[PDB]
Design a protein around this ligand. Structure first.
Ligand SMILES: CC(C)(COP(=O)(O)OP(=O)(O)OC[C@H]1O[C@@H](n2cnc3c(N)ncnc32)[C@H](O)[C@@H]1OP(=O)(O)O)[C@@H](O)C(=O)NCCC(=O)NCCS[C@](C)(O)CC(=O)O
Ligand SMILES: O=C([O-])C(=O)[O-]
Ligand SMILES: [Co+2]
Length: 483
Protein backbone atom coordinates (compact mmCIF):
# COMPACT_ATOMS: atom_id res chain seq x y z
CA UNK A 1 0.00 0.00 0.00
CA UNK A 2 1.69 3.16 -1.33
CA UNK A 3 -0.09 6.55 -1.41
CA UNK A 4 1.15 9.95 -2.59
CA UNK A 5 0.00 13.19 -0.95
CA UNK A 6 -0.98 16.28 -2.94
CA UNK A 7 -0.70 19.67 -1.25
CA UNK A 8 -3.12 22.42 -2.41
CA UNK A 9 -1.98 25.64 -0.63
CA UNK A 10 -4.01 28.44 -2.32
CA UNK A 11 -7.09 27.60 -4.36
CA UNK A 12 -9.85 29.94 -5.53
CA UNK A 13 -12.07 30.50 -2.49
CA UNK A 14 -10.39 31.20 0.87
CA UNK A 15 -8.85 34.61 1.59
CA UNK A 16 -5.88 35.98 3.51
CA UNK A 17 -6.65 37.76 6.78
CA UNK A 18 -4.04 40.07 8.30
CA UNK A 19 -4.22 39.17 12.03
CA UNK A 20 -2.72 42.59 12.91
CA UNK A 21 -5.41 44.73 11.25
CA UNK A 22 -8.54 45.98 13.02
CA UNK A 23 -11.40 43.48 12.97
CA UNK A 24 -14.07 45.95 14.10
CA UNK A 25 -15.00 49.44 12.88
CA UNK A 26 -17.48 51.28 15.17
CA UNK A 27 -20.24 53.09 13.26
CA UNK A 28 -19.56 56.28 15.25
CA UNK A 29 -16.02 56.72 13.89
CA UNK A 30 -17.30 56.02 10.37
CA UNK A 31 -20.35 58.33 10.36
CA UNK A 32 -18.53 60.73 12.69
CA UNK A 33 -15.57 61.46 10.40
CA UNK A 34 -16.98 61.20 6.88
CA UNK A 35 -19.66 62.84 4.73
CA UNK A 36 -22.71 60.60 4.30
CA UNK A 37 -21.71 59.74 0.73
CA UNK A 38 -18.10 58.76 1.48
CA UNK A 39 -19.29 57.01 4.65
CA UNK A 40 -21.67 54.97 2.48
CA UNK A 41 -18.78 54.50 0.06
CA UNK A 42 -16.45 52.95 2.66
CA UNK A 43 -19.27 50.84 4.16
CA UNK A 44 -20.02 49.44 0.70
CA UNK A 45 -16.31 48.76 0.12
CA UNK A 46 -16.10 46.87 3.44
CA UNK A 47 -19.17 44.71 2.74
CA UNK A 48 -17.61 43.73 -0.58
CA UNK A 49 -14.52 42.64 1.34
CA UNK A 50 -16.64 40.47 3.65
CA UNK A 51 -17.23 42.90 6.53
CA UNK A 52 -20.68 42.51 8.06
CA UNK A 53 -23.00 44.80 9.99
CA UNK A 54 -23.19 44.07 13.74
CA UNK A 55 -25.29 45.69 16.49
CA UNK A 56 -24.00 46.77 19.91
CA UNK A 57 -22.90 44.01 22.29
CA UNK A 58 -19.61 42.78 20.83
CA UNK A 59 -16.39 42.63 22.84
CA UNK A 60 -13.10 44.12 21.66
CA UNK A 61 -9.57 43.29 22.80
CA UNK A 62 -7.25 46.10 21.67
CA UNK A 63 -3.60 46.42 22.70
CA UNK A 64 -1.13 48.98 21.30
CA UNK A 65 -3.44 50.12 18.48
CA UNK A 66 -3.18 53.77 19.56
CA UNK A 67 -4.80 56.14 17.08
CA UNK A 68 -5.48 59.30 19.15
CA UNK A 69 -7.99 62.01 18.13
CA UNK A 70 -4.22 39.09 28.74
CA UNK A 71 -3.03 37.67 25.48
CA UNK A 72 -4.20 34.41 27.15
CA UNK A 73 -7.43 32.39 26.85
CA UNK A 74 -6.80 29.44 29.15
CA UNK A 75 -8.18 25.91 28.65
CA UNK A 76 -10.32 25.96 31.83
CA UNK A 77 -12.19 28.94 30.30
CA UNK A 78 -12.98 27.01 27.12
CA UNK A 79 -13.76 23.91 29.18
CA UNK A 80 -16.63 25.81 30.84
CA UNK A 81 -18.47 25.72 27.51
CA UNK A 82 -20.37 23.31 25.30
CA UNK A 83 -18.15 21.77 22.61
CA UNK A 84 -19.88 23.80 19.91
CA UNK A 85 -19.28 27.15 21.65
CA UNK A 86 -15.70 26.29 22.58
CA UNK A 87 -15.08 25.38 18.94
CA UNK A 88 -16.58 28.67 17.65
CA UNK A 89 -14.29 30.63 20.01
CA UNK A 90 -11.16 28.61 19.22
CA UNK A 91 -11.82 28.89 15.47
CA UNK A 92 -12.46 32.61 15.70
CA UNK A 93 -9.33 33.36 17.76
CA UNK A 94 -7.07 31.07 15.67
CA UNK A 95 -8.42 32.82 12.56
CA UNK A 96 -7.09 35.95 14.30
CA UNK A 97 -3.70 34.22 14.67
CA UNK A 98 -3.88 33.05 18.29
CA UNK A 99 -2.22 29.66 18.72
CA UNK A 100 -2.90 26.57 20.80
CA UNK A 101 -0.26 25.97 23.48
CA UNK A 102 0.97 22.51 24.47
CA UNK A 103 -1.36 22.73 27.49
CA UNK A 104 -4.37 23.50 25.28
CA UNK A 105 -4.64 27.19 26.17
CA UNK A 106 -5.09 29.85 23.49
CA UNK A 107 -2.20 32.27 23.29
CA UNK A 108 -1.55 35.49 21.34
CA UNK A 109 2.20 36.00 21.02
CA UNK A 110 2.47 39.59 19.83
CA UNK A 111 2.31 42.98 21.56
CA UNK A 112 -0.40 44.60 19.46
CA UNK A 113 -3.84 43.34 18.53
CA UNK A 114 -7.34 44.48 17.68
CA UNK A 115 -9.57 41.41 18.07
CA UNK A 116 -13.36 41.51 18.18
CA UNK A 117 -16.04 38.92 18.91
CA UNK A 118 -19.62 39.51 17.61
CA UNK A 119 -22.74 40.10 19.79
CA UNK A 120 -24.08 36.63 18.91
CA UNK A 121 -20.93 34.94 20.18
CA UNK A 122 -20.91 37.04 23.37
CA UNK A 123 -24.61 36.39 24.01
CA UNK A 124 -23.84 32.67 23.66
CA UNK A 125 -21.04 33.05 26.20
CA UNK A 126 -23.23 35.10 28.59
CA UNK A 127 -25.86 32.30 28.47
CA UNK A 128 -23.37 29.42 28.99
CA UNK A 129 -20.98 31.13 31.44
CA UNK A 130 -21.48 34.61 32.90
CA UNK A 131 -18.28 34.02 34.88
CA UNK A 132 -16.34 33.56 31.63
CA UNK A 133 -17.70 36.82 30.19
CA UNK A 134 -16.62 38.61 33.40
CA UNK A 135 -13.20 36.95 33.16
CA UNK A 136 -12.82 38.25 29.59
CA UNK A 137 -13.84 41.76 30.64
CA UNK A 138 -11.33 41.66 33.48
CA UNK A 139 -8.72 40.61 30.90
CA UNK A 140 -9.58 43.69 28.81
CA UNK A 141 -12.39 42.57 26.50
CA UNK A 142 -14.55 45.70 26.25
CA UNK A 143 -18.24 46.22 25.36
CA UNK A 144 -18.74 47.65 21.86
CA UNK A 145 -21.42 49.65 20.10
CA UNK A 146 -22.76 48.91 16.62
CA UNK A 147 -20.46 48.87 13.63
CA UNK A 148 -18.70 46.59 11.18
CA UNK A 149 -17.10 43.18 11.72
CA UNK A 150 -14.45 41.30 9.77
CA UNK A 151 -15.58 37.71 10.40
CA UNK A 152 -12.72 35.98 8.60
CA UNK A 153 -15.32 33.78 6.93
CA UNK A 154 -13.32 31.30 4.84
CA UNK A 155 -10.22 33.29 5.78
CA UNK A 156 -6.87 32.29 7.22
CA UNK A 157 -3.89 34.30 8.45
CA UNK A 158 -1.67 31.65 6.82
CA UNK A 159 -3.05 31.68 3.25
CA UNK A 160 -0.21 32.32 0.77
CA UNK A 161 -1.29 34.69 -2.04
CA UNK A 162 2.05 36.11 -3.27
CA UNK A 163 4.91 34.38 -5.12
CA UNK A 164 7.17 34.52 -2.04
CA UNK A 165 4.53 33.11 0.31
CA UNK A 166 3.47 30.45 -2.19
CA UNK A 167 7.05 29.29 -2.83
CA UNK A 168 7.68 29.05 0.89
CA UNK A 169 4.47 27.10 1.59
CA UNK A 170 5.15 24.85 -1.42
CA UNK A 171 8.59 24.09 0.02
CA UNK A 172 7.28 23.43 3.54
CA UNK A 173 4.50 21.21 2.19
CA UNK A 174 7.02 19.12 0.26
CA UNK A 175 9.34 18.81 3.26
CA UNK A 176 6.35 17.71 5.33
CA UNK A 177 5.78 14.83 2.87
CA UNK A 178 3.78 15.97 -0.18
CA UNK A 179 4.93 14.66 -3.58
CA UNK A 180 2.72 16.94 -5.72
CA UNK A 181 1.80 20.60 -5.16
CA UNK A 182 -1.34 21.94 -6.83
CA UNK A 183 -1.17 25.72 -7.36
CA UNK A 184 -3.43 28.72 -7.94
CA UNK A 185 -2.51 32.39 -8.22
CA UNK A 186 -4.52 35.44 -7.04
CA UNK A 187 -5.02 38.89 -8.58
CA UNK A 188 -4.05 41.40 -5.87
CA UNK A 189 -4.23 44.58 -7.97
CA UNK A 190 -7.44 46.04 -6.44
CA UNK A 191 -5.99 46.48 -2.93
CA UNK A 192 -6.84 49.75 -1.17
CA UNK A 193 -5.87 51.02 2.26
CA UNK A 194 -8.78 52.73 3.99
CA UNK A 195 -7.68 55.03 6.81
CA UNK A 196 -10.12 55.53 9.69
CA UNK A 197 -9.44 58.13 12.44
CA UNK A 198 -9.28 56.59 15.90
CA UNK A 199 -8.91 53.16 14.35
CA UNK A 200 -6.04 53.06 11.86
CA UNK A 201 -5.85 51.34 8.47
CA UNK A 202 -7.95 48.54 7.00
CA UNK A 203 -6.89 46.92 3.72
CA UNK A 204 -9.53 45.74 1.26
CA UNK A 205 -9.13 43.63 -1.91
CA UNK A 206 -10.85 40.77 -3.71
CA UNK A 207 -7.89 38.32 -3.81
CA UNK A 208 -9.71 37.05 -6.91
CA UNK A 209 -8.83 33.66 -8.31
CA UNK A 210 -6.90 34.35 -11.50
CA UNK A 211 -4.05 32.87 -13.54
CA UNK A 212 -1.29 35.47 -13.22
CA UNK A 213 1.56 34.83 -15.65
CA UNK A 214 4.12 37.08 -13.93
CA UNK A 215 3.45 35.29 -10.63
CA UNK A 216 4.13 31.90 -12.18
CA UNK A 217 7.28 33.19 -13.97
CA UNK A 218 8.50 33.87 -10.43
CA UNK A 219 7.04 30.88 -8.51
CA UNK A 220 8.05 28.13 -10.93
CA UNK A 221 11.84 28.85 -10.98
CA UNK A 222 11.85 29.84 -7.29
CA UNK A 223 10.37 26.47 -6.25
CA UNK A 224 12.56 24.39 -8.56
CA UNK A 225 15.80 26.05 -7.42
CA UNK A 226 15.21 24.93 -3.80
CA UNK A 227 13.27 21.72 -4.47
CA UNK A 228 13.93 20.57 -8.05
CA UNK A 229 12.01 17.35 -7.30
CA UNK A 230 8.75 19.36 -7.01
CA UNK A 231 5.89 18.05 -9.15
CA UNK A 232 3.99 21.24 -9.91
CA UNK A 233 0.29 20.88 -10.78
CA UNK A 234 -1.02 24.16 -12.14
CA UNK A 235 -4.68 25.12 -11.91
CA UNK A 236 -6.20 26.06 -15.28
CA UNK A 237 -9.55 26.92 -13.67
CA UNK A 238 -11.16 30.33 -14.21
CA UNK A 239 -13.55 30.03 -11.27
CA UNK A 240 -14.74 33.56 -10.59
CA UNK A 241 -13.79 34.67 -14.12
CA UNK A 242 -16.36 32.70 -16.15
CA UNK A 243 -15.87 34.98 -19.21
CA UNK A 244 -12.34 33.65 -19.61
CA UNK A 245 -13.52 30.07 -20.19
CA UNK A 246 -12.22 29.84 -23.79
CA UNK A 247 -9.16 32.04 -23.28
CA UNK A 248 -5.57 31.07 -24.28
CA UNK A 249 -4.70 32.31 -20.79
CA UNK A 250 -5.90 28.93 -19.44
CA UNK A 251 -2.84 27.33 -21.06
CA UNK A 252 -0.37 30.24 -21.21
CA UNK A 253 1.19 29.31 -17.84
CA UNK A 254 1.77 25.81 -19.20
CA UNK A 255 4.90 26.65 -21.17
CA UNK A 256 8.49 25.54 -21.27
CA UNK A 257 10.15 27.49 -18.44
CA UNK A 258 13.68 28.33 -19.57
CA UNK A 259 15.09 28.72 -16.04
CA UNK A 260 13.74 25.28 -15.22
CA UNK A 261 14.33 23.23 -18.37
CA UNK A 262 10.76 21.91 -18.33
CA UNK A 263 7.06 22.67 -18.66
CA UNK A 264 5.00 22.15 -15.50
CA UNK A 265 4.64 18.41 -14.85
CA UNK A 266 0.86 18.46 -14.29
CA UNK A 267 -2.15 20.72 -14.98
CA UNK A 268 -5.84 20.42 -14.10
CA UNK A 269 -8.28 19.46 -16.82
CA UNK A 270 -12.06 19.20 -16.45
CA UNK A 271 -13.73 17.63 -19.54
CA UNK A 272 -17.13 19.37 -19.00
CA UNK A 273 -18.79 22.49 -17.58
CA UNK A 274 -18.25 22.80 -13.85
CA UNK A 275 -21.40 24.22 -12.28
CA UNK A 276 -21.05 24.62 -8.50
CA UNK A 277 -24.36 24.42 -6.65
CA UNK A 278 -22.81 27.16 -4.52
CA UNK A 279 -22.45 29.29 -7.66
CA UNK A 280 -19.44 30.66 -9.55
CA UNK A 281 -18.50 27.82 -11.91
CA UNK A 282 -16.95 27.78 -15.39
CA UNK A 283 -17.36 26.18 -18.81
CA UNK A 284 -14.98 23.76 -20.50
CA UNK A 285 -16.16 23.46 -24.10
CA UNK A 286 -15.21 20.71 -26.60
CA UNK A 287 -13.20 23.11 -28.84
CA UNK A 288 -11.42 24.59 -25.82
CA UNK A 289 -10.61 21.10 -24.51
CA UNK A 290 -9.25 20.03 -27.88
CA UNK A 291 -6.87 23.00 -27.76
CA UNK A 292 -5.86 22.20 -24.14
CA UNK A 293 -5.08 18.56 -25.01
CA UNK A 294 -3.07 19.54 -28.11
CA UNK A 295 -1.09 21.94 -25.96
CA UNK A 296 -0.44 19.60 -22.98
CA UNK A 297 0.79 16.92 -25.38
CA UNK A 298 3.08 19.44 -27.10
CA UNK A 299 4.77 20.91 -23.99
CA UNK A 300 4.88 17.63 -22.07
CA UNK A 301 2.31 18.36 -19.34
CA UNK A 302 0.20 15.50 -17.86
CA UNK A 303 -3.44 16.42 -17.27
CA UNK A 304 -4.95 15.78 -13.88
CA UNK A 305 -8.60 15.01 -14.66
CA UNK A 306 -10.65 16.92 -12.05
CA UNK A 307 -13.67 14.73 -11.46
CA UNK A 308 -16.17 17.33 -10.32
CA UNK A 309 -19.23 15.50 -11.60
CA UNK A 310 -20.81 12.57 -13.43
CA UNK A 311 -20.68 14.42 -16.74
CA UNK A 312 -16.89 14.35 -16.38
CA UNK A 313 -16.77 10.64 -15.45
CA UNK A 314 -18.92 9.95 -18.50
CA UNK A 315 -16.93 12.21 -20.85
CA UNK A 316 -13.50 11.03 -19.71
CA UNK A 317 -14.34 7.34 -20.09
CA UNK A 318 -15.91 7.75 -23.55
CA UNK A 319 -15.16 10.65 -25.94
CA UNK A 320 -11.94 11.94 -24.33
CA UNK A 321 -10.52 8.50 -23.47
CA UNK A 322 -8.02 8.27 -26.35
CA UNK A 323 -6.89 11.86 -25.80
CA UNK A 324 -6.27 11.05 -22.14
CA UNK A 325 -4.27 7.93 -23.07
CA UNK A 326 -2.16 9.99 -25.52
CA UNK A 327 -1.14 12.53 -22.88
CA UNK A 328 0.59 9.80 -20.92
CA UNK A 329 -0.02 6.81 -18.68
CA UNK A 330 -0.89 6.43 -15.88
CA UNK A 331 -3.86 8.74 -16.42
CA UNK A 332 -4.35 10.96 -13.35
CA UNK A 333 -7.69 11.65 -11.65
CA UNK A 334 -8.75 13.72 -8.65
CA UNK A 335 -12.14 12.96 -7.12
CA UNK A 336 -13.64 16.30 -6.08
CA UNK A 337 -15.82 14.59 -3.50
CA UNK A 338 -18.26 16.42 -1.22
CA UNK A 339 -18.69 19.56 -3.34
CA UNK A 340 -22.30 19.81 -4.61
CA UNK A 341 -22.62 20.10 -8.42
CA UNK A 342 -25.32 20.79 -10.99
CA UNK A 343 -25.72 19.63 -14.52
CA UNK A 344 -27.55 22.13 -16.72
CA UNK A 345 -30.03 21.04 -19.40
CA UNK A 346 -29.02 23.19 -22.42
CA UNK A 347 -32.53 23.02 -23.94
CA UNK A 348 -34.65 24.04 -20.92
CA UNK A 349 -31.92 25.63 -18.79
CA UNK A 350 -32.96 23.60 -15.74
CA UNK A 351 -30.34 22.19 -13.37
CA UNK A 352 -30.17 18.87 -11.60
CA UNK A 353 -27.83 17.31 -9.05
CA UNK A 354 -24.66 15.94 -10.72
CA UNK A 355 -22.42 15.57 -7.62
CA UNK A 356 -20.11 12.58 -7.10
CA UNK A 357 -21.66 12.21 -3.65
CA UNK A 358 -25.39 12.90 -4.29
CA UNK A 359 -26.40 16.07 -2.48
CA UNK A 360 -28.99 14.28 -0.28
CA UNK A 361 -26.32 11.80 0.84
CA UNK A 362 -23.74 14.58 1.25
CA UNK A 363 -26.25 16.43 3.45
CA UNK A 364 -26.70 13.23 5.48
CA UNK A 365 -22.92 12.79 5.76
CA UNK A 366 -22.56 16.38 6.98
CA UNK A 367 -25.15 15.85 9.73
CA UNK A 368 -23.49 12.56 10.81
CA UNK A 369 -20.18 14.41 11.18
CA UNK A 370 -22.01 16.80 13.50
CA UNK A 371 -23.06 13.98 15.89
CA UNK A 372 -19.33 13.60 16.37
CA UNK A 373 -19.62 10.00 17.56
CA UNK A 374 -17.55 7.08 16.27
CA UNK A 375 -20.77 5.28 15.30
CA UNK A 376 -21.88 8.24 13.21
CA UNK A 377 -18.37 8.53 11.79
CA UNK A 378 -18.49 4.90 10.57
CA UNK A 379 -21.88 5.65 8.96
CA UNK A 380 -20.40 8.73 7.25
CA UNK A 381 -17.51 6.66 5.85
CA UNK A 382 -19.90 3.94 4.59
CA UNK A 383 -22.02 6.50 2.78
CA UNK A 384 -19.08 8.27 1.09
CA UNK A 385 -17.52 5.00 -0.05
CA UNK A 386 -20.91 3.80 -1.28
CA UNK A 387 -21.41 6.88 -3.43
CA UNK A 388 -17.85 6.96 -4.79
CA UNK A 389 -17.30 3.26 -5.37
CA UNK A 390 -19.08 2.95 -8.77
CA UNK A 391 -17.24 6.07 -10.00
CA UNK A 392 -13.88 4.59 -8.96
CA UNK A 393 -14.78 1.24 -10.53
CA UNK A 394 -15.85 2.92 -13.79
CA UNK A 395 -12.58 4.90 -13.95
CA UNK A 396 -10.49 1.78 -13.19
CA UNK A 397 -12.34 -0.23 -15.85
CA UNK A 398 -11.80 2.41 -18.53
CA UNK A 399 -8.21 3.25 -17.50
CA UNK A 400 -6.40 0.15 -16.08
CA UNK A 401 -3.20 2.21 -15.89
CA UNK A 402 -4.33 5.11 -13.69
CA UNK A 403 -3.81 6.91 -10.39
CA UNK A 404 -6.83 8.27 -8.54
CA UNK A 405 -6.73 10.72 -5.64
CA UNK A 406 -9.39 12.24 -3.38
CA UNK A 407 -10.04 15.65 -1.86
CA UNK A 408 -12.81 16.68 0.53
CA UNK A 409 -14.07 20.10 1.69
CA UNK A 410 -12.91 21.18 5.19
CA UNK A 411 -15.55 19.82 7.63
CA UNK A 412 -15.40 16.45 5.78
CA UNK A 413 -11.63 15.85 5.82
CA UNK A 414 -12.04 13.54 8.84
CA UNK A 415 -13.14 11.02 6.20
CA UNK A 416 -10.14 11.35 3.92
CA UNK A 417 -7.92 8.48 5.07
CA UNK A 418 -10.75 5.99 5.74
CA UNK A 419 -12.45 6.72 2.40
CA UNK A 420 -9.18 6.66 0.42
CA UNK A 421 -8.04 3.35 1.94
CA UNK A 422 -11.57 1.91 1.70
CA UNK A 423 -11.61 2.72 -2.03
CA UNK A 424 -8.02 1.66 -2.70
CA UNK A 425 -7.17 5.16 -3.94
CA UNK A 426 -3.58 6.02 -4.94
CA UNK A 427 -3.36 9.38 -3.19
CA UNK A 428 -4.86 11.98 -0.90
CA UNK A 429 -5.03 15.76 -1.25
CA UNK A 430 -5.12 18.27 1.61
CA UNK A 431 -4.53 22.01 1.86
CA UNK A 432 -6.01 25.43 2.63
CA UNK A 433 -7.56 25.32 -0.82
CA UNK A 434 -10.01 22.65 0.44
CA UNK A 435 -10.05 23.12 4.22
CA UNK A 436 -8.62 25.62 6.70
CA UNK A 437 -8.64 23.57 9.94
CA UNK A 438 -6.88 20.66 11.67
CA UNK A 439 -7.88 18.49 14.61
CA UNK A 440 -6.04 19.27 17.85
CA UNK A 441 -6.97 17.05 20.81
CA UNK A 442 -5.22 19.41 23.27
CA UNK A 443 -7.79 22.17 22.87
CA UNK A 444 -11.46 22.02 23.91
CA UNK A 445 -13.71 21.52 20.88
CA UNK A 446 -10.79 19.63 19.31
CA UNK A 447 -10.60 21.84 16.18
CA UNK A 448 -8.48 24.90 15.19
CA UNK A 449 -7.18 26.82 12.16
CA UNK A 450 -4.32 24.97 10.48
CA UNK A 451 -0.97 26.75 10.71
CA UNK A 452 -0.51 26.00 6.99
CA UNK A 453 -1.04 23.36 4.34
CA UNK A 454 2.26 21.79 5.52
CA UNK A 455 0.57 20.97 8.83
CA UNK A 456 -2.33 19.15 7.15
CA UNK A 457 0.16 17.27 4.97
CA UNK A 458 2.07 16.30 8.14
CA UNK A 459 -1.06 15.12 9.94
CA UNK A 460 -2.36 13.06 7.03
CA UNK A 461 1.08 11.48 6.51
CA UNK A 462 1.19 10.59 10.22
CA UNK A 463 -2.29 9.06 10.10
CA UNK A 464 -1.42 7.10 6.96
CA UNK A 465 1.80 5.67 8.45
CA UNK A 466 -0.09 4.41 11.51
CA UNK A 467 -2.43 2.58 9.13
CA UNK A 468 0.64 0.80 7.78
CA UNK A 469 0.49 2.67 4.48
CA UNK A 470 3.66 3.71 2.62
CA UNK A 471 4.06 7.36 1.50
CA UNK A 472 5.71 7.96 -1.89
CA UNK A 473 8.12 10.88 -2.36
CA UNK A 474 8.20 13.28 -5.27
CA UNK A 475 11.08 11.41 -6.98
CA UNK A 476 9.28 8.09 -6.65
CA UNK A 477 6.02 9.59 -7.96
CA UNK A 478 7.83 11.23 -10.89
CA UNK A 479 9.61 8.01 -11.85
CA UNK A 480 6.56 5.77 -11.36
CA UNK A 481 4.31 8.13 -13.38
CA UNK A 482 6.88 8.78 -16.09
CA UNK A 483 6.34 12.53 -15.66
C1 LIG B 1 -13.83 27.90 1.53
C2 LIG B 1 -13.30 26.70 2.33
C3 LIG B 1 -11.80 26.35 1.87
C4 LIG B 1 -13.34 27.07 3.82
O1 LIG B 1 -12.87 25.97 4.56
P1 LIG B 1 -13.34 25.75 6.07
O2 LIG B 1 -12.29 24.90 6.78
O3 LIG B 1 -13.45 27.08 6.80
O4 LIG B 1 -14.73 24.98 6.06
P2 LIG B 1 -16.20 25.61 6.02
O5 LIG B 1 -17.21 24.54 5.68
O6 LIG B 1 -16.26 26.67 4.95
O7 LIG B 1 -16.57 26.25 7.44
C5 LIG B 1 -17.80 26.97 7.60
C6 LIG B 1 -18.10 27.16 9.03
O8 LIG B 1 -17.95 25.89 9.78
C7 LIG B 1 -16.90 26.06 10.74
N1 LIG B 1 -16.11 24.88 10.73
C8 LIG B 1 -15.16 24.53 9.83
N2 LIG B 1 -14.66 23.32 10.17
C9 LIG B 1 -15.29 22.89 11.29
C10 LIG B 1 -15.19 21.73 12.10
N3 LIG B 1 -14.25 20.67 11.77
N4 LIG B 1 -15.99 21.63 13.17
C11 LIG B 1 -16.88 22.61 13.47
N5 LIG B 1 -16.99 23.72 12.74
C12 LIG B 1 -16.20 23.87 11.64
C13 LIG B 1 -16.16 27.28 10.35
O9 LIG B 1 -15.65 27.97 11.49
C14 LIG B 1 -17.17 28.12 9.69
O10 LIG B 1 -17.87 28.90 10.68
P3 LIG B 1 -19.14 29.84 10.24
O11 LIG B 1 -20.32 28.98 9.76
O12 LIG B 1 -19.59 30.69 11.41
O13 LIG B 1 -18.70 30.74 9.12
C15 LIG B 1 -14.29 25.50 2.16
O14 LIG B 1 -15.52 25.88 2.61
C16 LIG B 1 -14.45 24.99 0.72
O15 LIG B 1 -15.06 25.61 -0.14
N6 LIG B 1 -13.90 23.68 0.39
C17 LIG B 1 -14.10 23.21 -0.94
C18 LIG B 1 -12.92 23.57 -1.82
C19 LIG B 1 -13.05 23.07 -3.28
O16 LIG B 1 -14.06 23.30 -3.95
N7 LIG B 1 -11.97 22.29 -3.83
C20 LIG B 1 -12.12 21.83 -5.18
C21 LIG B 1 -10.92 22.25 -6.00
S1 LIG B 1 -10.88 21.41 -7.58
C22 LIG B 1 -9.33 21.74 -8.38
C23 LIG B 1 -8.60 20.51 -8.34
O17 LIG B 1 -8.58 22.71 -7.67
C24 LIG B 1 -9.53 22.07 -9.89
C25 LIG B 1 -8.71 23.16 -10.52
O18 LIG B 1 -7.88 23.83 -9.83
O19 LIG B 1 -8.85 23.38 -11.75
O1 LIG C 1 -10.20 24.73 -7.65
C1 LIG C 1 -11.45 24.86 -7.86
O2 LIG C 1 -12.32 24.44 -7.04
C2 LIG C 1 -11.87 25.55 -9.09
O3 LIG C 1 -11.52 26.74 -9.23
O4 LIG C 1 -12.55 24.94 -9.97
CO1 LIG D 1 -7.52 24.05 -7.64
Amino acid sequence: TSLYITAAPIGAVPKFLDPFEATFIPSFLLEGFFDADRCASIAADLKTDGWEVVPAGGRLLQVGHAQPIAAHFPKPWLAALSNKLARRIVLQLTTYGWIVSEQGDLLWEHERQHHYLPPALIEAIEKESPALLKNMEEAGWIACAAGYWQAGKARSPYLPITPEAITEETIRSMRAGAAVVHLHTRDLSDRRRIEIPGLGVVTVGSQRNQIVLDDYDAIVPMVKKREPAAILNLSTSVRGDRHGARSKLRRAHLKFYDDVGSAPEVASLSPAAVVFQGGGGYDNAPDFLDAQFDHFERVGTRPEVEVFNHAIVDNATSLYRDRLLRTGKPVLFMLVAGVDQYRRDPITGEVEDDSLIARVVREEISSLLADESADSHRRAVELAIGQLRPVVERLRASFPVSKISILLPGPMQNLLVDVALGLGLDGIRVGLEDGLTVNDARVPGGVRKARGTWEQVSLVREELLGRGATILTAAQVRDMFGL
